Amino acid sequence: IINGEDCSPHSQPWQAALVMENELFCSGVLVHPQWVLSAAHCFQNSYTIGLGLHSLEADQEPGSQMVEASLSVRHPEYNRPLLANDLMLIKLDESVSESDTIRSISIASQCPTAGNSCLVSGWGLLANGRMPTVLQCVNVSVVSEEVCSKLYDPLYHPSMFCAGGGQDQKDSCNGDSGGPLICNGYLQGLVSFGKAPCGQVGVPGVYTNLCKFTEWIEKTVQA
Ligand SMILES: NC(=[NH2+])c1ccc(N)cc1
Numbered sequence: 578i579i580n581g582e583d584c585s586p587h588s589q590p591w592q593a594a595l596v597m598e599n600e601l602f603c604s605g606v607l608v609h610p611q612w613v614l615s616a617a618h619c620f621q622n623s624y625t626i627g628l629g630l631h632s633l634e635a636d637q638e639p640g641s642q643m644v645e646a647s648l649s650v651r652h653p654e655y656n657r658p659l660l661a662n663d664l665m666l667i668k669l670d671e672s673v674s675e676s677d678t679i680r681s682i683s684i685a686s687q688c689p690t691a692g693n694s695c696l697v698s699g700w701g702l703l704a705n706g707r708m709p710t711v712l713q714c715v716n717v718s719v720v721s722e723e724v725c726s727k728l729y730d731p732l733y734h735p736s737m738f739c740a741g742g743g744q745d746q747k748d749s750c751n752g753d754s755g756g757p758l759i760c761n762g763y764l765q766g767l768v769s770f771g772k773a774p775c776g777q778v779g780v781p782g783v784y785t786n787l788c789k790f791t792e793w794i795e796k797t798v799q800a
C-alpha cells in the first residue's frame with residue numbers, strides 16, 4: 578500500500594491473507610462464511626488462508642483463524658482479453674466462525690462512480706519499497722470509466738475500474754493483489770494491477786469490477 582497508514586487493528590474484518598510458509602503472496606476477501614474471494618492471478622492448488630490478522634503472525638491474534646482450502650473456482654473468462662475478469666472464489670474446507678475480528682462483507686450492487694472516496698488495504702509494498710509489518714489502509718478515489726478506458730487502452734475491459742492516480746500518490750502495489758477496495762461499506766473491487774513504479778500521478782491502479790459479477794458469485798457460492 579503506497580502512502581497509507583497502519584489500519585486500526587481488526588477494522589477490516591473481511592481481510593484474508595493468502596500465505597505460504599515464508600511469504601505472503603496475495604490477499605483475499607471473505608464474502609461468505611465458507612468462501613474467500615481473490616484475484617484469479619493469485620491461484621494455487623491449495624491455500625493456507627489467514628483471517629483476523631493484523632500482523633501476519635497468527636499467535637499474536639487470539640481470534641485469528643488460519644484455514645485450509647483446495648477448491649478454487651476462477652471466472653471462466655479470466656485473462657480474456659489480457660488481464661480481464663480477474664476474480665476467483667476459494668471454498669474453504671470448513672466455514673469460518675464469524676466474530677468481532679472476522680466477518681464477511683457483501684459485494685457492491687452499485688457500480689463504481691467517479692469521485693467515490695474508497696478504501697484499499699493490504700500487506701503489500703510500501704512507498705520505500707519495503708513490506709509493512711501490519712495491515713495498511715489508504716483512501717483512493719474512483720476514476721471515471723471514460724478516463725480509465727482511455728488511459729489503459731487496449732487493456733481496459735468492463736470487468737475493470739480505476740481508482741487513485743492523484744498527486745497524493747496513494748495506490749496499492751505488489752503484494753496487495755486480491756485485497757479489498759471498499760466503497761460505501763461494500764466490497765467494490767479487488768486489487769488487480771497497475772503500473773510500476775506504483776503511485777505515479779495520473780496513473781491509477783486497476784481493480785476487478787465486482788458489481789459485474791455478483792450473479793456469477795451468487796451462483797458459484799450457492800450452488
Ligand atoms: N495498483 C498497483 N500499482 C498494483 C496492484 C497490484 C500489483 N500486483 C502491482 C501493482
Ligand SMILES: [Cl-]
Pocket residue numbers: 691719720721724
Ligand atoms: Cl475521472
Ligand code: NA
Pocket residue numbers: 660661662663736737769770783784785
Ligand atoms: Na483486471
Ligand code: NA
Pocket residue numbers: 685687688689765766785786787788789
Ligand atoms: Na464494482
Ligand code: NI
Pocket residue numbers: 598599600
Ligand atoms: Ni514469516
Ligand code: NI
Pocket residue numbers: 586587631637638639
Ligand atoms: Ni488483535
